[PDB]
């Protein structure tokens, strides 16, 4: 049973919730107030320390519950007070810081081999084509952003219904050979694809924020260490 604790206890340490909006408000005001009258060149350190101390002070609750599940409690409190006395930034911290289907190729070059069906996956973020349906080859990748839909130039006979994907806002050609014409058996599939591409985001035919996020990245990294330590001392302090 006393080893149910020491495995329930980590659960009590992860019941803590943080209001990120209030957190970013406090970080911003901390940076501005620390510089005082100056505009500052580098991110202040006291902004990091002030936030971390506020979060560490909450660990007292689960630790006292674990004990209940005089001298023992006094030791636990002391082991938490000493966590607020010094910020050891050398302890392994960050030092120095939608639609799928088979589609054929209409414009065939030497690199295409022939007019064959390829497995195509469309997501909100990117586009991918594969020789098979295992989605492992990753032969061709194309981004949804900076992409535009195009129609086949007048004169093409609709033996197969085709839509074209052409990247227009990138210097990366993304292997857009002959405008990357993809054919379907019926027009309904082509229109469904075009709608899917546009829904994905395809074109239809202060520096203070970086500092705030950098502080947040550091605070989370440090508290990962602090939680690891308290998870280790509590099973030992109570035994001793």
Q: Is residue 112 part of a domain?
A: yes
∠ CA 149-154-156, rounded to 5° = 95
Contacts of 50 (CB under 8 A, 6+ apart): 30
147 shares a domain with 223: no
Do 53 and 107 lie in one domain? The reply is: no
Alpha-carbon distance of 140 to 28, in angstroms, equals: 43
Q: Is residue 192 domain-shared with residue 218, that is, in the same domain? A: no
Beta-carbon contacts of residue 101 (< 8 Å; ≥ 6 apart): 119, 120, 189, 193
What does the H/E/C string look like for the chain?
CCCCCCCCHHHHCCCCCCCHHHHHHHHHHHHHHHHCCCCCCCCCCHHHHHHHHHHHHHHHHHHHHHHHCCHHHHHHHHHHHHHHCCCCCCCCCCCCCCEEEEEEECCCCHHHCCCCEEEEEECCCEEEEECCCCCCCCCEEEECCCEEEECCCCCCCCCCEEEEEEECCCCCCCCCHHHCEEEECCHHHHHHHHHHHHHHCCECCCCHHHHHHHHHHHHHHHHHHHHHHHHHHHHHHHHC
Using alpha carbons only, what angle is made at residue 60 by residues 56 and 62, rounded to the nearest 5 degrees? 110
Residue 45 lies in a domain: yes
My answer on whether 125 and 189 are in the same domain is yes
- Same domain, yes or no: 44 and 126: no
Question: Residue 33's CB: how many other CB atoms inside 10 A?
Answer: 12
Are 109 and 178 a contacting pair, CB within 8 Å? yes
Q: How far is Cα 187 from Cα 51, in angstroms, rounded to an integer?
A: 58
Same domain, 107 and 47: no
Residue ranges making up the domain that contains 214: 9-87+207-239
Taking the CA atoms of 219, 221, 225 and 227 in sequence, report the sign of the dihedral they define.
positive
Q: How many domains does the chain have?
A: 2
Report if residue 1 sits inside a domain.
Answer: no
Q: Are residues 13 and 83 in the same domain?
A: yes
Quick one: which of 224, 220, 229, 226 has its CA closest to 23? 220
Residues 54 and 147 in one domain: no
Residues 113 and 70 in one domain: no
Say what the alpha-carbon torsion angle 137, 140, 144, 148 is, to the nearest 10 degrees: -150
Same-domain pairing of 151 and 192? yes
Are 14 and 35 within one domain?
A: yes
Q: Using what technique was this structure determined?
A: cryo-EM
How crowded is residue 226: how many other Cβ atoms within 10 Å of its Cβ? 16
Instruction: Answer yes or no: do 105 and 161 share one domain.
Output: yes
d(CA 202, CA 193): 11
């Amino acid at each position: 049973i006393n080893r149910i604790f020491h495995e329930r206890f980590p659960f009590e340490l992860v019941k803590m919730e943080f209001d990120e909006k209030e957190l970013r408000r406090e970080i911003s005001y901390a940076i501005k107030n620390i510089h005082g009258i100056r505009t500052g060149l580098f991110t202040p350190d006291m902004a990091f320390e002030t936030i971390v101390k506020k979060q560490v002070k909450k660990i007292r609750e689960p630790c006292l519950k674990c004990v209940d599940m005089g001298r023992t409690k006094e030791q636990v409190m002391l082991l938490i007070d000493i966590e607020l006395a010094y910020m050891n930034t050398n302890h392994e911290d960050f030092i120095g810081f939608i639609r799928k289907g088979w589609l054929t190729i209409n414009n065939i070059g030497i690199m295409k081999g022939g007019s064959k069906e390829y497995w195509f996956v469309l997501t909100a973020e990117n586009l991918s084509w594969y020789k098979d349906d295992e989605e492992k080859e990753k032969k061709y990748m194309l981004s949804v952003d900076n992409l535009k839909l195009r129609d086949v130039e007048k004169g093409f006979m609709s033996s197969k219904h085709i839509f074209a994907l052409f990247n227009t806002e990138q210097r990366n050609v993304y292997k857009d050979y002959r405008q990357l014409e993809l054919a379907c058996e019926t027009q309904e599939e082509v229109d469904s694809w075009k709608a899917s591409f546009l829904r994905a985001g395809v074109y239809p035919e202060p520096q203070l924020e970086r500092q705030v996020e950098t502080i947040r990245n550091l605070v989370d990294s440090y508290m990962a260490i602090v939680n690891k330590t308290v998870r280790d001392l509590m099973p030992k302090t109570i035994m001793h």
